[PDB]
Amino acid sequence: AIADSLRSQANTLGQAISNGNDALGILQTADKAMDEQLKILDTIKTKA
Amino acid sequence: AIADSLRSQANTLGQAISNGNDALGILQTADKAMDEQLKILDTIKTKA
Fold first, then answer.
1. Which of B2, B4, B5 to probe the A interface (max A CBs under 10 A)?
2. Which of A1, A43, A44, B37 is the most exposed, having the fewest neighbouring CB atoms within 10 Å of its CB?
3. Do the Cβ atoms of B15 and A46 come within 8 Å?
4. How many CB atoms lie under 10 A from the CB of residue B8?
5. Which among B4, B6, B10 has a CA at the least distance from the CA of A36?
6. Considering only CA atoms, which of A42, A4, A23, A41 is closest in space to residue B7?
7. Which residues are within 8 A (CB) of A31 and not within 5 positions of it... i.e. 6 or more apart?
């Protein structure tokens, strides 16, 4: 029983790592996207 | 955040330099144009 609980928990954590990596990918994409908007706003202010 | 604020300030100042140079050109043009009016007025007084 203990070994089965530990196996279930180990599999759950091995999947949680992948969930975390997916969240990392999404957030990195979002930030690297925001970078260009920052540069564009800088350009707008310079033109003004 | 600070890096972007300072980049915005650097770009704004770099454009302000060009605005100042344009103002300098305009004022120099106006003054060197007034010079001939001064000489003409001198000539008019001499003829009177």
1. B4
2. A1
3. yes
4. 15
5. B4
6. A42
7. none
